[PDB]
Amino acid sequence: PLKVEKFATANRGNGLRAVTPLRPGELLFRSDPLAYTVCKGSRGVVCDRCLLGKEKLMRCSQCRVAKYCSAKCQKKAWPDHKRECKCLKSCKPRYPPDSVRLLGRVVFKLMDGAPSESEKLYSFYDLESNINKLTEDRKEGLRQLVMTFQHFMREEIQDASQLPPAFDLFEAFAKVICNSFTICNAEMQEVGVGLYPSISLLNHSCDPNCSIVFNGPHLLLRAVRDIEVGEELTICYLDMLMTSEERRKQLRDQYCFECDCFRCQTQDKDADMLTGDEQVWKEVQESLKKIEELKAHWKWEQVLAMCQAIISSNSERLPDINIYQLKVLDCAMDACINLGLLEEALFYGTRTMEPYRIFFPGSHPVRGVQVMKVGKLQLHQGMFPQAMKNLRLAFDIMRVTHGREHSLIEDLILLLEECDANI
Ligand SMILES: C[S@@+](CC[C@H](N)C(=O)[O-])C[C@H]1O[C@@H](n2cnc3c(N)ncnc32)[C@H](O)[C@@H]1O
Ligand SMILES: [Zn+2]
Ligand SMILES: [Zn+2]
Numbered sequence: 001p002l003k004v005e006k007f008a009t010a011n012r013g014n015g016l017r018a019v020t021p022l023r024p025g026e027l028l029f030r031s032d033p034l035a036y037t038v039c040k041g042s043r044g045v046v047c048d049r050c051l052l053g054k055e056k057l058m059r060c061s062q063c064r065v066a067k068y069c070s071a072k073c074q075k076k077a078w079p080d081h082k083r084e085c086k087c088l089k090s091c092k093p094r095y096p097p098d099s100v101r102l103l104g105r106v107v108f109k110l111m112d113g114a115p116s117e118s119e120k121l122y123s124f125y126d127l128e129s130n131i132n133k134l135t136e137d138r139k140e141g142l143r144q145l146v147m148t149f150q151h152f153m154r155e156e157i158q159d160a161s162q163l164p165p166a167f168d169l170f171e172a173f174a175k176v177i178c179n180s181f182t183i184c185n186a187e188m189q190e191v192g193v194g195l196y197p198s199i200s201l202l203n204h205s206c207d208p209n210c211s212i213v214f215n216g217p218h219l220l221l222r223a224v225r226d227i228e229v230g231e232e233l234t235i236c237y238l239d240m241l242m243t244s245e246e247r248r249k250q251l252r253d254q255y256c257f258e259c260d261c262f263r264c265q266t267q268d269k270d271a272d273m274l275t276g277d278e279q280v281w282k283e284v285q286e287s288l289k290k291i292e293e294l295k296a297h298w299k300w301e302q303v304l305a306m307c308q309a310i311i312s313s314n315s316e317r318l319p320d321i322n323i324y325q326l327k328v329l330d331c332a333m334d335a336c337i338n339l340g341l342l343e344e345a346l347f348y349g350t351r352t353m354e355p356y357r358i359f360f361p362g363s364h365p366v367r368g369v370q371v372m373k374v375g376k377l378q379l380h381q382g383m384f385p386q387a388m389k390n391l392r393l394a395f396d397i398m399r400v401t402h403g404r405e406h407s408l409i410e411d412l413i414l415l416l417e418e419c420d421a422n423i
């Protein structure tokens with residue numbers, strides 16, 4: 001039986017609340033997506049279905065846009081790819097925005113598919129759209145998406161009759177804007193985008209009592225604090241490495257609300273996040289736009305070159321607790337891991353440890369994975385005691401955030417065995 005229930009909140013629409021007392025690490029819900037797709041940067045880098053990277057992917061012979069890691073994945077993806085195939089083919093070489101491909105998959109799923117388990121607590125139809133809060137600029141954006149969708153879908157959908165009854169394309173894209181989940185791989189690289197409508201019941205907190213993790217497109221919702229009966233369940237919608245100003249802008253632009261939490265009222269941590277010379281971190285913040293774009297396209301060599309010019313600059317440097325500096329170190333570490341530059345990766349990774357401890361309090365899956373990456377680097381270098389403390393710390397965090405149902409935990413147990421036996 002469910003440990004969570006939908007309820008109507010006083011001032012933030014519908015939410016989820018505990019039906020029984022919950023402890024850290026308690027599995028609360030598991031969901032596949034109602035619909036999902038690979039993101040623009042990872043298209044052709046990860047399998048369309050299982051979202052795992054591979055040096056060589058096979059492509060769908062009809063559209064040559066969908067790509068897969070194996071015959072099995074291509075075959076199993078076919079029912080949900082079949083109708084989009086003709087639309088993807090007939091629009092080459094124009095590839096649609098991610099949201100447009102995602103909505104295509106929603107419409108086909110709702111038209112041809114059995115009722116989805118993802119919609120057990122809340123369906124696509126119930127999703128919040130924030131229509132009466134959208135700015136004129138946002139509305140103009142949505143109208144362009146509607147027309148893009150109508151074009152993309154021409155081959156399969158000619159009119160309302162082939163859409164679910166009373167389906168409003170404008171309102172559907174509005175739901176997508178505030179309800180899309182970014183799907184991350186085991187290394188916490190963004191690889192996909194999906195709708196998980198039951199999970200969409202979780203309201204936001206900059207200091208949450210729950211967490212979500214992805215294992216391919218499969219999502220796990222876990223408690224990360226003690227939660228009493230009737231208490232609202234919350235997740236953080238946002239990157240932890242953001243100032244209250246940055247959080248304000250995103251919660252406004254994407255989700256149409258103002259956060260009244262304690263952290264927003266007091267600018268909790270903002271001063272520490274922005275230490276170092278303002279001129280310097282402004283330029284770093286600007287450069288990070290290009291760096292993140294490159295990372296999103298798995299361009300590790302170019303990512304590294306740009307990060308090294310900042311980390312080892314001839315001019316003034318930032319403290320590692322500065323969030324822009326911190327992100328640069330994170331990107332540099334990941335580029336080094338993927339390029340096999342393990343010594344350099346470890347230098348960057350170890351410098352991130354204390355700032356991560358500060359910015360990801362309690363149990364957060366991003367800290368757990370970062371700590372696991374550092375311990376794994378230490379283990380490969382044969383620094384067994386330093387490795388063992390980090391692997392154990394990773395396990396303390398990830399047993400709460402990931403749990404036994406996540407395959408990455410089994411990988412970590414192997415690493416602890418390998419390190420413990422060597423000790
Ligand atoms: C993923 S949905 C969450 C469930 C939503 N309350 C509903 O009724 O369907 C995201 C939307 O919920 C509302 N919301 C989420 N967190 C909030 C918060 N902390 N304060 C006020 N509104 C919030 C905003 O309307 C936001 O766009
Ligand atoms: Zn696959
Ligand atoms: Zn195809």
Ligand SMILES: [Zn+2]
Binds near residue numbers: 206259
């Ligand atoms: Zn807040």
